[PDB]
Design a protein around this ligand. Structure first.
Ligand SMILES: O=c1ccn([C@@H]2O[C@H](COP(=O)(O)OP(=O)(O)O[C@H]3O[C@H](CO)[C@@H](O)[C@H](O)[C@H]3O)[C@@H](O)[C@H]2O)c(=O)[nH]1
Ligand SMILES: O=c1ccn([C@@H]2O[C@H](COP(=O)(O)OP(=O)(O)O[C@H]3O[C@H](CO)[C@@H](O)[C@H](O)[C@H]3O)[C@@H](O)[C@H]2O)c(=O)[nH]1
Ligand SMILES: O=c1ccn([C@@H]2O[C@H](COP(=O)(O)OP(=O)(O)O[C@H]3O[C@H](CO)[C@@H](O)[C@H](O)[C@H]3O)[C@@H](O)[C@H]2O)c(=O)[nH]1
Ligand SMILES: O=c1ccn([C@@H]2O[C@H](COP(=O)(O)OP(=O)(O)O[C@H]3O[C@H](CO)[C@@H](O)[C@H](O)[C@H]3O)[C@@H](O)[C@H]2O)c(=O)[nH]1
Ligand SMILES: [Mg+2]
Ligand SMILES: [Mg+2]
Ligand SMILES: [Mg+2]
Ligand SMILES: [Mg+2]
Ligand SMILES: [Mg+2]
Ligand SMILES: [Mg+2]
Ligand SMILES: [Mg+2]
Ligand SMILES: [Mg+2]
Lengths: 299, 299, 295, 294
């Protein structure tokens, strides 16, 4: 009820998808037919958000364009017989208002988020951040997360339990103490992509955050961490060490990391199987490919 | 036999992937991490082609750019010393030289091929066409098609047997007779996307063509067909009727149609399972997803 | 009559390099307004409802000028200029026709064939780097065509130093109307010696659809380019009637600095905001030059 | 000087509708854009980088300083060897570094964006506005001398007519120096009404600023036109006792930011062109005469 603007950092290089991402933004990759950024925009609308501050890069024009009307394209589609599609290409743009925020160089997720400071209304008390390459299903974890912030103030992040092998890929929470609800916990530290030996838990940060504006000040104090980037994680950890309250909402359901082929492909399968048109066939197709590989393997 | 130019029609709307394709060309979608265009480019270079005539559209600039140096991106990956990443994004340009050919409006695949006429060297004997959303594996069918052409002269296409389910999506051949070779059949007609009841065979046209320069002539005499588009198939069918010799090489191996989600997903799964980095985890993830779907469908 | 007007704008603009490295010469301001926009209202004035703009892959700006600037519009109101920027797009419907390589004016014009409606019987071409003032020659030209049928071009007298920059006519017969002559020849950029006259073609043509067939019969000429002049000449050589309407009024070649600069001065002097100051500024700059030359 | 900051992220409203897609900084002065003249000026002073403040809808600004593989090839085809070098000049002269200004919040704002782009080595913020020509080039060399001998901040002014005060930052003079061309300043006002102008000395777009403007730029409130004015920040620095001196340029100065200054600039350079010179003189004189008679 309080969130007006949601910050969607989409200015990365997407190295894990190269060469494809040389000119295609990972954020626009179709989960069946729909980009994760469009998925994120829809979730933000559901949250009541009225604007989307998209952090973008100079060589990623499509990100913002996806949310603008393309009369060239709509016209073409008219004279071809399909108004049905003109609607599909207007959905994102119509869902919410996209406000582009340029990030010249990909200095970090944290640095990206800091860029949106000037863009929020002075009247906004929280910074809602949604990573466009991360899906938390069913949608609504943000509604749960806001409830927790109302109750405890401070910042709140969404977490998922992860396998020992996936811990190095995420921001990992250091649990401080449990809470009235088993799915809400207070945290004592946050660490970005730790070696498996030095990971405080198996609780990993998904791309959902409801942060206290204090973050911006914490982001100006932080120095570069993992991979030489200015990490949102490190600023959250800063706030933690200062005494600011930071809780996690532990998500029980489906989570899809669209950020690399390993998570993206299964996401396409997942959504592909429930699709009214492709469902049946995909299943058959995939079962045969799985079998083909099993055979290959033994041989 | 001496192919110099290979025509790669990459100017369509990609309706099947909308809304993602609003700004992203389907030809650039990652099969794991590599666009189908880059794979076709590799298949063309393998054939000994030296140049790629990419029919592109005004709104699809990424297609050409994928084949040209990306200064700022290499400079960004350099700072970080992502050396392997720099080579990755140079690969396409190193494979073959891309020549853009604009098709202002998606008048059909036939029309697109027709725009390549002027681009070819006058010394060029055939019109080699490789559709960028269709993988025929392993690469080499084009070499076999050239042998067939050297022998019977005339025009040659590549066919794969397809289920009734896939019939209406492809160009289907009308068989005349079995020839000298088991894999080669002489064709007496071609129909674009027939209904199942109308399909003269189960042999569908793969996007691989070695056409006699006479198609240009033929392409100017056809009228719109399926979709109100100017179909290449319709021109070939025209030549056949005017007694031009047309043969098909029937591909026995794997074939992936990347042109739509139904075929793109499984291609991704198929290449993904063979991937050194993603293989194992994909296998488990997809098994789990299949199993979750089973339970859901019961529950 | 005219429904569509062909505006070739896919050239390289080498005379303005290095500026034209990214800027289309067709977009340079005549004070504040691009020549293409000036051609667009001349087109609209005539009746045309479509503008077939021949463009190049790297001149996205050309068409964009006739498209909406939502991004830019949202920035403007915030602080009477949004009026100004919506102008060109509201004057007429731009239809982009891509010409991948600049093979020639003649080649560029040929690309429009497939774009003109079937019921269309004239090929109206207006070069966007050439101003014929006041607007309306095309109304005149159209009259000459209603009478004589055939193809009509607009000319203006020019001088030896400036003869080699244009398409030059070979006069056949004077005529009734002092300003309408029949032509028996047309040569592109003839050396000073060769010019069959001093009557040069401006960028205004009303051509019979036959120009399309003629364009397929010619070979490269003057600059290794497929010259529209050459196809016109072929049509002449074969008995197709071709007449020129001679413009006695003002004309500006915005296609090169020597022509663009004076065009800016001309419109600038009549400017309600800038006129007075420009006048003073230029008069002093001239004076400084005069002095510099002697001194 | 290592980095010259060049603010080119403006709307260029004065040249609309043309500037809808064309950056005003790219308009040819005959055939050379102001940004290229400014780049040549920066190079002459020894700068190796140009930090260009650019806007999302002005890609050409930066493209102008990059190699056009597609255009160079097309020109090689027609064998135009000179032209290739012509389109390479800018790019060869200096390294362009883009800095994006999403919205045109002001010249001061724009300048602020270049902070994190300067090296620590660098003691000064050299700013050259690409729509203003101070001729002949070299005023910055002079301004440097002045800074060396007074420390602090240095601007370049030109005497201007009453008619033109409102278009510029106008200085309030405080005192003279050993040199008649150098004055210490006591205030700066952006675009004052005629009655309100404290001098007839206008700021040209040349600055050698102490690194303290960054700090000041964060502090000033928007000023004239709703913008964060660089002038207001320089004034703030004045108001807190920081030393600011102006080199008064006695020579030629061409304001290319609006049609009134741009047209005359083109005439002036055109009259000197070995190719267009003579013909322009004649064409212009003739046009003036027609206007007379009209
Ligand atoms: O300089 C940058 C770097 C990234 N991004 C964007 O930020 C998002 C996240 O970047 P990515 O490289 O995918 O981050 P991950 O390595 O996936 O890690 C982040 O996302 C995870 C949840 O998905 C968390 O577990 C990690 O703590 C958090 O750092 C993407 O949309 C990028 O486009 C930028 O805009 N600018
Ligand atoms: O006006 C157009 C239409 C399409 N394309 C391009 O042509 C290729 C083929 O287009 P697509 O719609 O994918 O064709 P399909 O329906 O997949 O059918 C074509 O390819 C099949 C094999 O994949 C054959 O069975 C068919 O006979 C043949 O028409 C694509 O890369 C398009 O981008 C154009 O360049 N211009
Ligand atoms: O391959 C090309 C070449 C040019 N153009 C455009 O066509 C128009 C004319 O090109 P330009 O190089 O300026 O031609 P000129 O050399 O000025 O000569 C043409 O226009 C003159 C009138 O201005 C006539 O005197 C000539 O006969 C005619 O050829 C311009 O807008 C160009 O952008 C194209 O679209 N494609
Ligand atoms: O939000 C902005 C506003 C402007 N600019 C750039 O800054 C330069 C200066 O902008 P301009 O609008 O031309 O300012 P003026 O009205 O010309 O005023 C500036 O330049 C004058 C001299 O040219 C000085 O007298 C003034 O005090 C100074 O404010 C131009 O290149 C703009 O592109 C930006 O980058 N961002
Ligand atoms: Mg990253
Ligand atoms: Mg990620
Ligand atoms: Mg199709
Ligand atoms: Mg296909
Ligand atoms: Mg030319
Ligand atoms: Mg011209
Ligand atoms: Mg301004
Ligand atoms: Mg200015």
């Amino acid at each position: 009820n309080a969130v007006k603007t949601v910050v969607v950092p989409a200015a990365g290089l997407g190295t894990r998808f190269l060469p494809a991402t040389k000119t295609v933004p990972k954020e626009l990759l179709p989960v069946v037919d729909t980009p994760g950024i469009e998925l994120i925009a829809a979730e933000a609308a559901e949250l009541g958000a009225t604007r989307l501050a998209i952090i973008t890069a100079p060589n990623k024009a499509g990100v913002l364009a996806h949310f603008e009307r393309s009369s060239e394209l709509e016209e073409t589609l008219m004279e071809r017989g399909k108004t049905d599609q003109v609607e599909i290409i207007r959905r994102a743009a119509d869902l919410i208002k996209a406000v582009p925020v340029t990030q010249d160089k990909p200095l970090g997720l944290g640095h990206a988020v800091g860029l949106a400071e000037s863009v929020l209304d002075d009247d906004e008390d929280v910074v809602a951040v949604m990573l466009p390459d991360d899906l938390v299903l069913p949608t609504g974890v943000m509604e749960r997360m806001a409830q927790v912030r109302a109750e405890f103030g401070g910042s709140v992040l969404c977490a998922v339990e992860v396998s020992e092998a996936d811990v190095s890929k995420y921001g990992i929470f250091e649990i401080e103490a449990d809470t009235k609800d088993s799915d809400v916990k207070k945290v004592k530290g946050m660490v970005e992509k730790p070696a498996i030996e030095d990971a405080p838990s198996r609780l990993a940060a998904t791309g959902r955050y409801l942060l206290d504006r204090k973050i911006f000040d914490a982001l100006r104090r932080i120095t570069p961490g993992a991979g030489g980037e200015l990490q949102l994680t490190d600023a959250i950890d800063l706030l933690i060490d200062e005494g600011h309250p930071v809780h996690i909402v532990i998500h029980q359901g489906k989570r899809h990391d669209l950020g690399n082929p390993g998570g993206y492909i299964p996401a396409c399968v997942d959504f592909g199987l429930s699709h009214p048109v492709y469902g049946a066939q995909l299943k058959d197709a995939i079962k045969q490919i799985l079998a083909e590989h099993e055979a290959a393997e033994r041989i």
